[PDB]
Every structure is written in structure tokens, then in C-alpha cells.
Coordinates of C-alpha atoms and ligand atoms in Angstrom, one line a residue:
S1 CA 140.5 19.5 -72.9
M2 CA 137.2 17.7 -72.5
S3 CA 134.1 19.9 -72.5
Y4 CA 132.8 17.7 -69.6
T5 CA 133.8 14.9 -67.4
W6 CA 131.3 12.7 -65.6
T7 CA 131.4 10.7 -62.3
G8 CA 128.5 8.4 -63.4
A9 CA 125.9 9.9 -61.1
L10 CA 122.7 10.6 -63.1
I11 CA 121.3 14.0 -64.1
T12 CA 118.3 13.8 -61.7
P13 CA 114.9 15.6 -61.8
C14 CA 113.6 17.9 -59.1
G15 CA 109.9 16.8 -59.0
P16 CA 107.7 14.8 -61.4
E17 CA 108.1 15.1 -65.2
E18 CA 105.1 14.7 -67.5
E19 CA 106.2 13.3 -70.8
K20 CA 103.0 13.4 -72.8
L21 CA 100.2 15.9 -73.6
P22 CA 96.9 15.0 -71.9
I23 CA 93.7 14.5 -73.8
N24 CA 91.6 17.5 -72.9
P25 CA 88.9 19.4 -74.8
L26 CA 90.5 22.8 -74.3
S27 CA 93.7 21.6 -75.9
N28 CA 92.0 19.2 -78.3
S29 CA 90.1 22.0 -80.0
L30 CA 93.5 23.5 -81.0
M31 CA 95.1 20.2 -82.2
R32 CA 93.9 16.6 -82.1
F33 CA 97.1 14.6 -82.4
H34 CA 98.1 14.7 -78.8
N35 CA 100.3 11.5 -79.1
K36 CA 102.7 13.5 -81.3
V37 CA 103.5 16.0 -78.5
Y38 CA 106.2 15.3 -75.9
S39 CA 108.1 17.2 -73.2
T40 CA 111.8 16.4 -72.7
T41 CA 112.8 15.0 -69.4
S42 CA 115.8 13.8 -67.3
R43 CA 115.2 10.3 -68.8
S44 CA 117.1 11.3 -71.9
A45 CA 119.8 13.4 -70.1
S46 CA 122.5 10.8 -70.6
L47 CA 121.9 10.9 -74.4
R48 CA 122.5 14.6 -74.4
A49 CA 125.6 14.3 -72.2
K50 CA 127.2 12.0 -74.8
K51 CA 126.6 14.6 -77.6
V52 CA 127.9 17.6 -75.7
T53 CA 131.0 15.8 -74.4
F54 CA 134.1 15.9 -76.6
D55 CA 137.7 17.2 -76.7
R56 CA 138.4 20.6 -78.2
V57 CA 141.6 21.4 -80.1
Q58 CA 141.7 25.1 -81.1
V59 CA 144.2 26.6 -83.5
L60 CA 144.2 30.4 -84.0
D61 CA 145.7 32.4 -86.9
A62 CA 146.3 35.9 -88.1
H63 CA 142.7 36.4 -89.3
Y64 CA 141.5 35.7 -85.8
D65 CA 144.2 37.9 -84.2
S66 CA 143.3 41.0 -86.3
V67 CA 139.5 40.7 -85.6
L68 CA 140.3 40.4 -81.8
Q69 CA 142.6 43.4 -81.9
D70 CA 139.8 45.5 -83.6
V71 CA 137.3 44.2 -81.0
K72 CA 139.5 45.2 -78.0
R73 CA 140.1 48.7 -79.6
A74 CA 136.3 49.2 -80.0
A75 CA 135.8 47.9 -76.4
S76 CA 138.1 50.7 -75.1
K77 CA 135.4 53.4 -75.9
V78 CA 132.9 51.8 -73.4
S79 CA 132.6 53.1 -69.8
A80 CA 130.4 51.0 -67.4
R81 CA 129.4 50.9 -63.7
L82 CA 128.3 48.5 -61.0
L83 CA 124.6 48.1 -60.2
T84 CA 123.4 48.6 -56.6
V85 CA 122.0 45.5 -54.9
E86 CA 118.5 46.9 -55.1
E87 CA 118.8 47.3 -58.9
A88 CA 120.1 43.7 -59.4
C89 CA 117.3 42.4 -57.1
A90 CA 114.7 44.1 -59.3
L91 CA 116.2 42.4 -62.4
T92 CA 115.6 38.9 -60.8
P93 CA 112.6 37.0 -62.3
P94 CA 109.8 36.2 -59.8
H95 CA 110.2 32.4 -60.5
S96 CA 114.0 32.2 -60.5
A97 CA 115.4 29.1 -58.8
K98 CA 115.5 29.5 -55.1
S99 CA 118.8 29.6 -53.1
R100 CA 119.9 26.8 -51.0
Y101 CA 120.7 29.4 -48.2
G102 CA 117.0 29.7 -47.1
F103 CA 115.5 32.2 -49.4
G104 CA 114.1 32.5 -53.0
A105 CA 113.2 35.0 -55.8
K106 CA 110.3 36.4 -53.7
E107 CA 112.7 37.4 -50.9
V108 CA 115.3 38.9 -53.3
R109 CA 112.6 41.1 -55.0
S110 CA 111.2 42.3 -51.7
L111 CA 114.8 43.1 -50.4
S112 CA 114.4 40.8 -47.4
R113 CA 117.3 41.2 -45.0
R114 CA 118.3 37.6 -45.1
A115 CA 118.5 37.7 -48.9
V116 CA 120.4 41.0 -49.1
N117 CA 122.8 40.0 -46.3
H118 CA 123.5 36.8 -48.1
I119 CA 124.1 38.5 -51.4
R120 CA 126.5 40.9 -49.7
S121 CA 128.5 37.9 -48.3
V122 CA 128.7 36.4 -51.8
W123 CA 130.0 39.7 -53.2
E124 CA 132.7 40.1 -50.5
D125 CA 133.8 36.5 -51.1
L126 CA 134.2 37.3 -54.9
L127 CA 136.4 40.3 -54.0
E128 CA 138.5 38.2 -51.7
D129 CA 138.8 34.8 -53.4
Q130 CA 139.6 34.9 -57.1
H131 CA 140.2 31.1 -57.6
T132 CA 138.1 28.5 -55.8
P133 CA 135.6 26.9 -58.3
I134 CA 132.0 27.8 -57.6
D135 CA 129.4 25.0 -57.4
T136 CA 126.8 24.6 -60.1
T137 CA 123.7 22.5 -60.5
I138 CA 123.0 20.5 -63.7
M139 CA 119.4 19.9 -64.7
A140 CA 117.6 18.5 -67.8
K141 CA 115.3 21.1 -69.3
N142 CA 111.6 20.3 -69.7
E143 CA 110.7 21.7 -73.2
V144 CA 107.8 20.8 -75.5
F145 CA 108.1 19.6 -79.1
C146 CA 106.3 17.7 -81.8
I147 CA 107.8 14.4 -83.0
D148 CA 109.7 14.8 -86.3
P149 CA 109.6 11.8 -88.7
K150 CA 112.3 12.5 -80.0
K151 CA 115.2 14.8 -79.2
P152 CA 117.1 14.5 -75.8
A153 CA 116.6 17.2 -73.2
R154 CA 118.9 20.2 -73.3
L155 CA 121.1 20.5 -70.2
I156 CA 121.3 23.7 -68.0
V157 CA 124.2 24.5 -65.7
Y158 CA 123.8 27.3 -63.2
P159 CA 125.1 28.7 -59.9
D160 CA 123.1 29.5 -56.8
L161 CA 120.7 32.5 -56.8
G162 CA 123.0 34.5 -54.5
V163 CA 125.8 34.2 -57.2
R164 CA 123.3 35.0 -60.0
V165 CA 122.3 38.4 -58.4
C166 CA 126.0 39.2 -58.0
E167 CA 126.7 38.5 -61.7
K168 CA 124.1 41.2 -62.6
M169 CA 125.7 43.7 -60.2
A170 CA 129.1 43.2 -61.9
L171 CA 128.1 42.8 -65.6
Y172 CA 124.6 44.1 -66.4
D173 CA 125.8 47.6 -67.4
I174 CA 128.6 46.2 -69.6
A175 CA 126.1 43.8 -71.2
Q176 CA 123.9 46.9 -72.2
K177 CA 126.8 48.6 -74.0
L178 CA 129.6 46.3 -75.1
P179 CA 128.1 44.1 -77.8
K180 CA 126.9 47.1 -79.9
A181 CA 130.2 48.9 -79.4
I182 CA 132.2 46.0 -80.7
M183 CA 129.9 44.7 -83.5
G184 CA 127.8 47.7 -84.5
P185 CA 124.9 46.7 -86.8
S186 CA 126.0 42.9 -86.6
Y187 CA 124.8 42.6 -83.0
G188 CA 121.4 41.0 -83.6
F189 CA 119.7 41.4 -80.2
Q190 CA 119.4 45.2 -80.6
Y191 CA 116.7 44.8 -83.3
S192 CA 113.0 44.4 -82.8
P193 CA 111.4 42.0 -85.2
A194 CA 110.7 44.7 -87.8
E195 CA 114.3 46.1 -87.4
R196 CA 115.7 42.6 -88.0
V197 CA 113.7 42.4 -91.2
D198 CA 114.8 45.8 -92.3
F199 CA 118.5 44.9 -91.7
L200 CA 118.2 41.6 -93.6
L201 CA 116.3 43.2 -96.5
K202 CA 118.8 46.1 -96.8
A203 CA 121.8 43.7 -96.6
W204 CA 120.2 41.5 -99.3
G205 CA 119.3 44.5 -101.5
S206 CA 122.8 46.0 -101.2
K207 CA 124.4 43.1 -103.2
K208 CA 124.5 42.8 -107.0
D209 CA 124.1 39.0 -106.7
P210 CA 123.3 38.2 -103.1
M211 CA 124.2 34.9 -101.5
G212 CA 123.4 34.0 -97.9
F213 CA 124.0 31.1 -95.5
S214 CA 123.4 30.2 -91.9
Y215 CA 126.1 28.4 -89.9
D216 CA 125.0 25.8 -87.4
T217 CA 127.7 25.2 -84.8
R218 CA 127.4 21.7 -83.3
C219 CA 126.6 22.3 -79.6
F220 CA 128.2 25.8 -79.5
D221 CA 128.4 26.0 -75.7
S222 CA 130.6 22.9 -75.7
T223 CA 132.9 24.2 -78.3
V224 CA 133.7 27.4 -76.3
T225 CA 137.2 26.8 -74.8
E226 CA 138.7 28.0 -71.5
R227 CA 140.8 30.3 -73.5
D228 CA 137.8 31.7 -75.4
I229 CA 136.3 32.5 -72.0
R230 CA 139.4 34.3 -70.7
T231 CA 139.5 36.2 -74.0
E232 CA 136.0 37.3 -73.3
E233 CA 137.3 38.6 -69.9
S234 CA 140.0 40.6 -71.6
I235 CA 137.3 42.3 -73.8
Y236 CA 135.3 43.2 -70.6
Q237 CA 138.5 44.6 -69.0
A238 CA 139.3 46.8 -72.1
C239 CA 136.3 48.9 -71.0
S240 CA 136.7 51.6 -68.4
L241 CA 135.5 50.1 -65.2
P242 CA 135.7 50.7 -61.4
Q243 CA 138.5 48.6 -59.9
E244 CA 135.9 46.8 -57.7
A245 CA 134.1 45.7 -60.9
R246 CA 137.4 44.5 -62.5
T247 CA 138.2 42.3 -59.5
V248 CA 134.8 40.6 -59.3
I249 CA 134.7 40.1 -63.1
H250 CA 138.0 38.3 -62.9
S251 CA 136.8 36.2 -60.0
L252 CA 133.6 35.2 -61.8
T253 CA 135.6 34.4 -64.9
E254 CA 138.1 32.2 -63.0
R255 CA 135.7 30.5 -60.6
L256 CA 132.5 30.2 -62.6
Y257 CA 132.7 31.1 -66.4
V258 CA 135.8 29.1 -67.4
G259 CA 134.5 25.9 -65.6
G260 CA 133.7 24.2 -62.4
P261 CA 132.0 21.3 -60.6
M262 CA 128.5 20.2 -61.3
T263 CA 126.1 18.8 -58.8
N264 CA 122.8 17.0 -59.5
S265 CA 119.4 17.9 -57.8
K266 CA 120.1 15.2 -55.1
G267 CA 123.4 16.9 -54.0
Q268 CA 125.6 14.2 -55.7
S269 CA 128.8 15.2 -57.6
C270 CA 127.9 14.7 -61.3
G271 CA 130.7 16.1 -63.4
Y272 CA 133.2 18.9 -64.2
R273 CA 132.8 21.6 -66.9
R274 CA 135.5 23.2 -69.0
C275 CA 133.2 25.0 -71.4
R276 CA 130.5 27.6 -71.5
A277 CA 127.9 27.4 -68.7
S278 CA 124.5 27.5 -70.2
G279 CA 122.9 29.2 -67.2
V280 CA 125.1 32.2 -66.4
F281 CA 124.4 35.9 -66.9
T282 CA 127.1 36.1 -69.6
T283 CA 126.0 33.1 -71.7
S284 CA 124.2 35.2 -74.4
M285 CA 126.7 38.1 -74.5
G286 CA 129.7 35.8 -74.5
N287 CA 128.4 33.5 -77.2
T288 CA 127.5 36.6 -79.3
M289 CA 131.0 38.1 -79.1
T290 CA 132.8 34.9 -79.6
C291 CA 130.7 33.7 -82.5
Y292 CA 131.2 37.2 -84.1
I293 CA 135.0 37.0 -83.7
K294 CA 135.4 33.4 -85.1
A295 CA 132.9 34.1 -87.9
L296 CA 134.3 37.4 -89.2
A297 CA 137.8 35.9 -89.1
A298 CA 136.6 32.8 -90.9
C299 CA 135.0 35.0 -93.6
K300 CA 138.5 36.6 -94.2
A301 CA 140.1 33.1 -94.2
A302 CA 137.5 31.7 -96.7
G303 CA 137.6 34.7 -99.0
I304 CA 134.0 35.7 -98.4
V305 CA 133.4 39.0 -100.2
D306 CA 131.9 42.0 -98.4
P307 CA 130.2 40.0 -95.6
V308 CA 127.2 41.4 -93.7
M309 CA 126.7 39.2 -90.6
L310 CA 123.9 39.0 -88.1
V311 CA 124.9 37.3 -84.8
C312 CA 122.5 36.4 -82.0
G313 CA 124.4 34.2 -79.5
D314 CA 125.4 31.0 -81.3
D315 CA 123.2 31.9 -84.3
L316 CA 125.0 33.3 -87.4
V317 CA 123.8 34.5 -90.8
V318 CA 126.1 35.8 -93.4
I319 CA 125.1 37.7 -96.6
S320 CA 127.8 38.4 -99.2
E321 CA 128.5 38.7 -103.0
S322 CA 128.0 35.5 -104.9
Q323 CA 131.3 34.4 -106.6
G324 CA 129.5 31.9 -108.8
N325 CA 127.7 28.6 -108.0
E326 CA 130.8 26.3 -107.7
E327 CA 132.9 29.0 -106.1
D328 CA 130.3 29.8 -103.4
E329 CA 130.2 26.1 -102.5
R330 CA 134.1 26.1 -102.3
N331 CA 134.1 29.2 -100.1
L332 CA 131.6 27.8 -97.6
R333 CA 133.7 24.6 -97.2
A334 CA 136.7 26.9 -96.5
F335 CA 134.6 29.0 -94.0
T336 CA 133.6 25.7 -92.3
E337 CA 137.3 24.5 -92.2
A338 CA 138.3 27.8 -90.5
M339 CA 135.5 27.8 -88.0
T340 CA 136.4 24.2 -87.2
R341 CA 140.1 25.2 -86.5
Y342 CA 138.7 27.9 -84.2
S343 CA 136.7 25.3 -82.3
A344 CA 133.3 25.8 -83.8
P345 CA 132.7 22.7 -86.0
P346 CA 129.4 22.4 -87.8
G347 CA 126.2 20.3 -87.1
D348 CA 124.3 20.8 -90.4
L349 CA 126.7 21.8 -93.2
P350 CA 126.2 25.3 -94.4
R351 CA 124.7 25.7 -97.9
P352 CA 124.4 28.7 -100.2
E353 CA 121.0 30.2 -100.5
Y354 CA 119.9 32.6 -103.2
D355 CA 116.3 33.4 -102.0
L356 CA 116.0 35.6 -98.8
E357 CA 112.7 33.9 -97.7
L358 CA 114.6 30.6 -97.3
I359 CA 117.3 31.9 -95.0
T360 CA 116.6 31.2 -91.3
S361 CA 118.1 33.5 -88.6
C362 CA 117.1 32.5 -85.0
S363 CA 114.6 29.9 -86.4
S364 CA 112.9 32.9 -88.3
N365 CA 112.8 34.2 -91.8
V366 CA 111.6 37.2 -93.8
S367 CA 108.4 36.9 -95.9
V368 CA 106.1 39.3 -97.8
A369 CA 102.5 40.2 -98.0
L370 CA 100.2 43.1 -98.9
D371 CA 98.6 45.7 -96.6
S372 CA 95.1 47.4 -97.0
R373 CA 96.5 50.0 -99.4
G374 CA 98.1 47.3 -101.6
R375 CA 101.7 48.1 -100.6
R376 CA 104.3 45.3 -100.2
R377 CA 105.1 44.7 -96.5
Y378 CA 107.8 42.4 -95.1
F379 CA 107.7 40.7 -91.8
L380 CA 109.3 38.1 -89.6
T381 CA 107.7 34.6 -89.4
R382 CA 108.7 31.0 -88.6
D383 CA 107.6 27.4 -88.8
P384 CA 104.5 27.4 -86.5
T385 CA 104.7 23.7 -85.3
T386 CA 106.6 24.3 -82.1
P387 CA 104.6 27.5 -81.1
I388 CA 101.3 25.7 -81.6
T389 CA 102.4 22.5 -79.8
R390 CA 103.5 24.7 -76.8
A391 CA 100.3 26.7 -77.0
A392 CA 98.4 23.4 -76.6
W393 CA 100.5 22.1 -73.7
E394 CA 100.3 25.5 -71.9
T395 CA 96.5 25.6 -72.3
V396 CA 96.3 22.6 -69.9
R397 CA 99.5 23.1 -67.8
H398 CA 100.0 26.8 -67.2
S399 CA 103.6 28.0 -67.1
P400 CA 105.0 30.9 -65.1
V401 CA 106.2 32.0 -68.6
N402 CA 103.6 32.0 -71.4
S403 CA 105.4 31.1 -74.7
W404 CA 102.2 31.9 -76.6
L405 CA 102.3 35.6 -75.5
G406 CA 105.9 36.1 -76.7
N407 CA 104.8 34.5 -80.0
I408 CA 101.9 36.9 -80.4
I409 CA 104.2 39.9 -79.8
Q410 CA 107.1 38.7 -82.0
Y411 CA 105.1 37.2 -84.8
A412 CA 101.9 39.4 -84.7
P413 CA 101.7 40.1 -88.5
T414 CA 101.7 36.3 -89.4
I415 CA 98.7 34.4 -90.6
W416 CA 99.3 31.7 -88.0
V417 CA 99.4 34.1 -85.0
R418 CA 96.4 36.1 -86.2
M419 CA 94.1 33.2 -87.2
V420 CA 95.1 30.5 -84.7
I421 CA 97.0 31.7 -81.6
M422 CA 95.2 35.0 -81.1
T423 CA 91.8 33.3 -81.6
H424 CA 92.5 30.4 -79.3
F425 CA 93.9 32.5 -76.4
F426 CA 91.6 35.5 -76.5
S427 CA 88.7 33.0 -76.3
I428 CA 90.3 31.5 -73.1
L429 CA 90.9 34.9 -71.6
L430 CA 87.2 35.9 -72.1
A431 CA 86.2 32.5 -70.5
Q432 CA 88.3 33.1 -67.4
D433 CA 87.5 36.8 -67.3
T434 CA 91.2 37.5 -67.0
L435 CA 91.7 39.8 -70.0
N436 CA 93.0 42.5 -67.7
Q437 CA 95.7 40.4 -65.9
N438 CA 99.3 40.9 -66.5
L439 CA 101.2 37.8 -67.7
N440 CA 104.9 37.1 -68.0
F441 CA 106.6 35.9 -71.2
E442 CA 110.1 35.3 -72.7
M443 CA 111.7 37.4 -75.4
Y444 CA 115.4 37.3 -76.5
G445 CA 116.5 35.5 -73.3
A446 CA 114.6 37.9 -70.9
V447 CA 111.3 37.9 -69.1
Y448 CA 108.7 40.6 -69.4
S449 CA 105.2 41.5 -68.2
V450 CA 102.3 42.5 -70.4
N451 CA 98.5 43.1 -70.1
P452 CA 96.8 41.4 -73.0
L453 CA 94.5 44.4 -73.3
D454 CA 97.5 46.5 -74.4
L455 CA 98.4 44.2 -77.3
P456 CA 96.9 46.4 -80.0
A457 CA 99.1 49.4 -79.1
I458 CA 102.1 47.1 -78.5
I459 CA 101.7 45.5 -82.0
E460 CA 101.1 48.8 -83.8
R461 CA 104.3 50.2 -82.2
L462 CA 106.4 47.1 -83.2
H463 CA 104.8 46.1 -86.5
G464 CA 102.8 49.1 -87.7
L465 CA 99.0 49.4 -88.4
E466 CA 99.8 47.1 -91.4
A467 CA 100.0 44.2 -88.9
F468 CA 96.2 44.4 -88.7
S469 CA 95.6 44.2 -92.5
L470 CA 98.2 41.9 -94.2
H471 CA 96.7 39.6 -96.8
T472 CA 98.0 37.8 -99.9
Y473 CA 100.7 35.8 -98.0
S474 CA 103.4 33.9 -100.0
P475 CA 103.0 30.3 -101.1
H476 CA 106.1 29.2 -99.1
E477 CA 104.4 30.7 -96.0
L478 CA 100.9 29.3 -96.6
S479 CA 102.3 25.9 -97.5
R480 CA 104.1 25.7 -94.2
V481 CA 101.1 26.8 -92.1
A482 CA 98.9 24.2 -94.0
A483 CA 101.5 21.4 -93.4
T484 CA 101.6 22.2 -89.7
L485 CA 97.8 22.2 -89.3
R486 CA 97.7 18.8 -91.0
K487 CA 100.6 17.3 -89.0
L488 CA 99.1 18.4 -85.6
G489 CA 95.5 17.6 -86.5
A490 CA 94.5 21.2 -86.0
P491 CA 91.2 22.7 -87.5
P492 CA 91.8 24.2 -90.9
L493 CA 92.1 28.0 -91.3
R494 CA 88.5 28.4 -92.4
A495 CA 87.4 26.9 -89.0
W496 CA 89.6 29.4 -87.2
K497 CA 87.9 32.2 -89.1
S498 CA 84.5 31.0 -88.0
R499 CA 85.7 31.0 -84.3
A500 CA 87.3 34.4 -84.6
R501 CA 84.1 36.1 -85.7
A502 CA 82.6 35.0 -82.4
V503 CA 85.7 36.0 -80.3
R504 CA 85.7 39.5 -82.0
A505 CA 82.0 39.9 -81.3
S506 CA 82.5 39.0 -77.6
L507 CA 85.5 41.4 -77.3
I508 CA 83.6 44.4 -78.8
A509 CA 80.6 43.8 -76.4
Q510 CA 82.9 44.0 -73.4
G511 CA 83.7 47.6 -74.4
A512 CA 86.7 49.9 -73.7
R513 CA 90.1 48.2 -74.2
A514 CA 88.6 44.8 -75.0
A515 CA 86.6 46.4 -77.9
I516 CA 89.9 47.8 -79.3
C517 CA 91.3 44.3 -79.3
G518 CA 88.2 43.0 -81.2
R519 CA 88.3 45.8 -83.8
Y520 CA 92.0 45.8 -84.5
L521 CA 93.2 42.2 -83.9
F522 CA 90.3 40.5 -85.6
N523 CA 89.5 43.0 -88.5
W524 CA 90.7 40.2 -90.8
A525 CA 87.8 38.0 -89.7
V526 CA 84.9 40.2 -91.0
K527 CA 83.5 41.0 -94.4
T528 CA 82.8 44.7 -93.9
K529 CA 86.2 45.9 -92.7
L530 CA 86.6 48.8 -90.4
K531 CA 89.0 51.7 -91.2
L532 CA 91.7 51.3 -88.6
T533 CA 93.3 54.6 -87.3
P534 CA 96.5 54.9 -85.4
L535 CA 96.2 54.3 -81.7
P536 CA 97.5 57.3 -79.7
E537 CA 99.0 55.0 -77.0
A538 CA 101.1 53.2 -79.6
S539 CA 102.7 56.5 -80.7
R540 CA 103.9 57.1 -77.1
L541 CA 105.2 53.6 -76.3
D542 CA 108.9 53.0 -75.7
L543 CA 109.6 49.2 -76.2
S544 CA 113.4 49.4 -77.0
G545 CA 114.2 47.8 -73.6
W546 CA 112.5 44.6 -74.8
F547 CA 115.4 43.8 -77.3
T548 CA 118.5 43.4 -75.2
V549 CA 121.1 40.6 -75.0
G550 CA 119.2 38.8 -72.2
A551 CA 120.8 36.1 -70.0
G552 CA 121.6 32.4 -69.8
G553 CA 118.4 30.5 -69.0
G554 CA 116.3 33.7 -69.6
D555 CA 117.2 34.6 -66.0
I556 CA 116.5 38.4 -66.2
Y557 CA 113.3 40.4 -65.7
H558 CA 112.4 43.9 -66.8
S559 CA 109.6 45.9 -65.1
Ligands
VGI1 O1 91.1 34.5 -94.0 C1 91.9 33.8 -94.7 C2 91.6 32.4 -95.0 C3 90.4 31.8 -94.6 C4 90.2 30.5 -94.9 C5 91.2 29.8 -95.7 C6 92.4 30.4 -96.1 C7 93.4 29.7 -96.9 N1 93.1 28.4 -97.1 C8 93.6 27.6 -98.3 C9 94.6 26.5 -97.9 O2 94.8 26.2 -96.5 C10 94.6 30.4 -97.3 C11 94.8 31.7 -96.9 C12 93.8 32.4 -96.2 C13 92.6 31.7 -95.8 C14 94.0 33.8 -95.8 O3 95.0 34.5 -96.2 N2 92.9 34.5 -95.2 C15 93.3 35.8 -94.6 C16 93.1 37.0 -95.2 C17 93.4 38.2 -94.7 C18 94.0 38.2 -93.4 C19 94.3 37.0 -92.7 BR1 95.1 37.0 -91.0 C20 93.9 35.8 -93.3

């Protein structure tokens, strides 16, 4: 069946859409080549529609069947419950898209009677009607990139806010337990950055002759079939659940997850979906489970030897024993053929990699540096082009969700975060006198709230004290950072050091928590380095809840 059909009505914008980065001294100081920066808009939505629209023809086999049987068996050990309305309301992000029934996220979070009564009506209707397709809106995402020597907007398909709160009531608890129960250490969202690094390193080290590859599924959401989605339901139903939950889960599956009508921002019928919805609660969990099942089966089909997989939604990395250079190539082609039969054909063809630093999982890779005691330390990093470009845009057009803050937390040990991002934004915070203000940010498909003054303890907790003293880094790493600074027209690293000396000084003179930020975050910037001791708050922080499966569209909030 076709992943989508289309009436010919356009994918329309809500309000205005800025395409280009403005020329402004506060962003220009970070990077000069503003003409290279663009935000996607609804103008390119028809180009994306063409790419995501195709027929799927899935053929399953015994390798698939046995993996699925193991998965359902594992799922049987899980017990889950319904959330109360109040609990689901608290999980709603403050800037979630408003309902068309006369309330928005603010009213959900405050438990306004209109919002709660509406949500109760939606829940009752899900108990009563297990079949009528539920309406969705289709929008073009506005996301910022640098031109690569312009990509079309991604599309997002989501139901009304009343429905989204109900999805959490039915499935949030399952989503906290099921992926780990069925995948164990292959479930990637359980790991903080350091934990991901440790898992990859140990997997790599466990092989005599390691070989790794990443598999890029072409438009994964579109390749998910109606049957894949019903199979996901059967995995949820293998858990021990209250009957009320079982009913609503089946209704959500039949009316929303397997497909439905799509409406544009103007209220015009736009198309019909028979694939994964990109903006539902289950998008991340479902993609993870289904990717895992297809991938592990394909490893068996291809003859991949002793696979260790890391799966994060549609993102897949597999580390195994090399069978020789020719044979590895043969085996990946066979892996690809099997994935293709399972309805997950490739974009980029997979290729065998024999150096861990060059393997990319979730646009990230492991690299190495030295700490202040001269010990080797490994850490997660990535190509800094997109983070810096988004930092520049968000400097002049503030976003409810601050990408730069999530990049600080996730990539704190990196040279590019420490020298450029931290320097740029702590300067801005001092200038606004808003150091002490909580800001929201995305992380693994969820939204969180952090006070910049707590960053030192947050970073020590996630990355260790070594995050404040890494040096020496690798040439791969430094080459990539240098190439990005040149491409964007950013000041060179030596200029960022000059700036950071001043930001550190200003932070220390503010005293209290600001001074801790100066001393710890910017110790790299001074000649006479301070001896950094463990921060007592760091040793008492519980940040496990930051690394969960998240939700389609990042539509979940923890506080
Ligand atoms: O402070 C610098 C630095 C300052 C100026 C230029 C460079 C540099 N430039 C050469 C080519 O871009 C390469 C690495 C570092 C660096 C470099 O690794 N460090 C550095 C040392 C310790 C911690 C941190 Br964070 C950065």
C-alpha cells in the first residue's frame, strides 16, 4: 500500500516563515557567512512529499518470525499501568500545539476544567469507538541548517492535543519499561552520553577483529507498514495491563497509529497516511522496537557473526567479528537485501568500518583525549556545523527550546562546546543578567528545564571532572572543528580563547554559583590552572530520567 496519498491541497504554513539568517552583530561574532544559513519552510514541502511517498511490499521469513517470538516472550515479563489525567497533564510541554477545542498547553498544565473535561471526553470515546480514523494535521518543520556543497522540510503528522494527552495516559508507563525488557543493552535511549561511549567501546574491544557499520533506512517512518504497526500493538498487549488500557491501546492503534486522514493548517483535506505518524507518542518506541526486530533478523539472514547492536529509533549500529574484507562487503549486501525484504530499504548503502572513531551512531561518534592526570578518556562528539548554525540563529530568534543548551549538556567534554558554544552563550547570559533563569531544551526526544548556573554539577555528574580538563584531542576531531569554523566564517579557536578569558573573569567576579561556572567551565582558558575538586552537588544528582525513549515531535516534558 502507498505510504501516503494526496488530494493536491498544499502543505500550508501557520504564520510567517523566515528562510534566511539575518545580519546582526550578536550572531555575526559567532559566524560571518550568514548567507550559508537557511531554515526549511513549507515552500519545499511538496519536494519532501515526493520522497516519502512510495508503495511498500514486505516479505517476512523464519529469521524475522523467531526474533518476534523472542520479543513477545520478553514482553510478557512487563507489568504496566495507566497514568492519571493529572500525571499526563504534567508531562505536556508548555509550548505544545494548542487544541482546536478552545484550550492549549497552559490550560492542560494548570488542570483547567475545560481542558480536563475535554480530555475525559476523548478518553471515553477511545473506550467506545475502536475504528473511526482520527484526524491529524500535517505541517512542514522549520529547522535550521548550513548549505552543503538545500534539503526539503521534514513533515510532521500529529493529532489534536486532547488525543496526545490520552496517548500518555495509555502508553507512558509501557514506554518506560518495554524497550529495555525486549532489547536489553541494545536499547540505545537508556544510555547517557558516557554510557553510550562505554557500551560502544566495550562492544568494539570484545571482538578479535572488530567491524562496524551503520544502516541508514531511507525515510524509515514511510517504510513502516500497517502490519508492522499492528505487530507493535501485539507486543504492547503481551505485557500485563489493565483491560481499560488494552482497549484504548487497540483504539489508538486502529484509529491513529496504523493510518488516517491528514488536514493542512487551513482545514483542507490534504492526504491519507498508511505508515508511521511522525508526531505521535509511540513514534520513538515503535521505531526502536521495529528497527531492532528487522535488524536482528537481517543479521541472522546475512550471516553476521556475534552482532552487538545499538538501536535508537530508526538509527542502527552493528558491531561484529570481521570475516575478511571481501566477505564483510558480501555480508552487508546480504544484510541490506534482507532489510529491504522487511520493508526497510537503504538510503546511503552501508559500508564496513574498521576504526571506531569513524562510526556514527545518532549523528555522534566516540573520540579520545587526555585528562589533567594524563589518562586516556573517551567521549561523545559530532560534526559541529549544525549545532553552531542553530546557535547563531537562536541568538537572534529565541526558541522556546534552546538547542544550544542540549548541545552543552550532551557534548560538554568536546573542544567545540567548551571553546565556542559555552563562551558565546555565557557571555550573552551575563549581558542579559539572566544567568539564574531556567531554560527549556531537547534531549532524546523530550523537553527538560535547567538553570545554567547548575551546569558545572550537571556536567561533572554526566561526564566526570575530566570534562573540565580534556586536552590533546585527536586529529580527526580537530580537523572537523577547523573545517567547520572555516566553512561558517567563525573566529578561529585562538580568538575564542581570548574571549573566554574575559567571560571567565566576569563569571568569577559575580561570585557564588557564577564563580563556580567560571572556575570549572573555563579552566582550559587560563595559564595558571586551578586544581578542580569534586562538586558535592554533582555526587547527589539523579539525572537518569533525562535518558528515556522520548516521544514523536519531542512532545513530552519532565519536571
Ligand atoms: O586552547 C586550545 C587551543 C587554542 C588555540 C588554538 C588551538 C588549536 N589550533 C590549531 C588549528 O585550528 C588546536 C587545538 C587547541 C587550540 C586546543 O586543544 N586548546 C585546548 C587545550 C585544552 C583544552 C581545550 Br577546551 C582547548
